[PDB]
């Protein structure tokens, strides 16, 4: 029986850290956000995690100010007028209010916890009242008696309406540690690093996502590969397709970083530690953290197939229409040892069957559905709708595969369509 569908079950979040840094030397952040809306809505994501924007100085508890914005990023006003262009869209707002976020320990310190939740609560009413769907709390292992805060912030902000969200984010990969902060709380989103802490072969892959669903009794997640950081800085080059895939065809919220639909890499080991350009064309002034070339940008990757901006905007249109995708179940079949492969299905809407090789080399699917509920068994052949390999994809979509006889190439996923048979 259905729960009522939330604006967060339609499709992805996207996170945008650090607003100057994404927008660019045009405008202030708040302001020129709202540019780069209409760009925002051809990746069909649902909502948008931003910040923390508001007045931190550095380790100092009394000159930090939650409900004030940063002065070089905007007023209060301009956020309001973000809010209401963003909802013209359809696009919901989360904040960031990690409190310190400037210095070292983001929560400040241990003695200091009960300061912090006065100065927190007061500011979930004041943001609340200004229109935001929701709030974004990161590095929640900093935080002493994190699972306590986290139920009575949830409470605040589910007390004014279920379709207001809380996120919390973690460094950890633990699945206990995961699992405690989850037990705690009501349908709150966590990130983590659960999912590239990873040997990256097909069996391993398998045993990270069904472990985890398996131990959270398949209740609403979210699926990412960190907190905040781009998918490209912790997950290898040979795999950001097949990643891509994954996140999208997952049951549950696919949360990325701004970039990860370029896979834009981050600063490197010896410079600063900053937030990179969004790299809206192959111009000088978006050259840092590396110098960038056409097929880096937005510019370049929007007129070409192959590039991995096409293959997001594609999947993340078949995430907010397909049924199966949008809450469907999910069941992982047998396959040999180099892939993983599941199936997702709702009623007798179109099923999808998802397959990902692992290995650089040609291998053998060996499918198998020995345990399988009753309503659904595999077709002898499924629809191709989508490859990872843009060669494959320019001859090969929309065409038919018998399933008994499937062969991947190296590094290959595909997503295949099936009906409900009568
Ligand atoms: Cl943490």
Redesign the pocket.
């Known amino acids: 029986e259905l729960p009522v569908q939330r604006w967060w079950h339609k499709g992805a979040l996207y996170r945008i850290g650090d607003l100057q840094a994404f927008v660019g030397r045009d405008a202030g952040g708040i302001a020129g956000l709202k540019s780069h809306l209409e760009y925002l809505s051809t990746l069909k994501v649902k909502g948008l995690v931003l910040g923390p924007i508001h007045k931190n100085q550095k380790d100092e508890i009394n000159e930090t100010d939650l409900k004030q914005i940063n002065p070089t990023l905007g007023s209060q006003e301009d956020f309001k007028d973000l809010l209401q262009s963003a909802k013209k869209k359809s696009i919901h707002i989360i904040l960031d209010l990690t409190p310190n976020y400037q210095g070292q320990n983001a929560w400040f310190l241990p003695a200091q916890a009960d300061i912090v939740a006065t100065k927190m609560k007061e500011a979930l009413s004041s943001w609340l009242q200004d229109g935001v769907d929701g709030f974004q709390f990161?590095?929640?292992?900093?935080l002493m008696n994190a699972p306590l805060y986290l139920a009575e912030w949830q409470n605040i902000t589910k007390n004014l309406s279920e379709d207001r969200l809380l996120i919390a984010?973690?460094?950890?990969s633990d699945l206990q540690q995961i699992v405690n902060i989850l037990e705690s709380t009501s349908d709150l989103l966590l990130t983590s690093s659960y999912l590239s802490n990873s040997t990256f072969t097909g069996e391993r892959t398998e045993s990270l996502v069904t472990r985890f669903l398996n131990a959270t009794g398949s209740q609403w997640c979210s699926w990412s590969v960190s907190?905040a950081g781009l998918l490209a800085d912790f997950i290898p080059d040979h795999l950001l397709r097949l990643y891509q895939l994954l996140l999208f065809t997952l049951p549950g919220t696919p949360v990325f970083s701004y970039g990860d639909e370029l896979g834009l890499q981050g600063a490197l080991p010896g410079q600063p530690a900053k937030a990179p350009l969004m790299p809206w064309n192959e111009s000088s002034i978006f050259h840092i953290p590396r110098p960038v070339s056409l097929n880096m940008t937005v510019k370049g990757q929007n007129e070409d197939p192959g590039s991995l901006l096409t293959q997001f905007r594609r999947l993340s249109d078949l995430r907010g229409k397909e049924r199966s995708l949008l809450h469907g179940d999910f069941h992982a079949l047998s396959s040999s040892p180099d892939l993983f492969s599941y199936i997702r299905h709702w009623d007798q809407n179109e099923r999808y069957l998802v397959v990902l090789n692992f290995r650089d080399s040609g291998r053998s699917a060996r499918l198998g559905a020995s345990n399988l509920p009753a309503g659904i068994s595999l077709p002898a052949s499924a629809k191709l709708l989508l490859s990872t390999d843009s060669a494959r994809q320019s001859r090969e979509e929309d065409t038919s595969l018998k399933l008994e006889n499937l062969s991947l190439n190296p590094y290959e996923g595909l997503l295949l369509q099936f009906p409900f048979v009568a």
């Open positions: 990161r590095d929640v292992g900093k984010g973690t460094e950890s907190q």
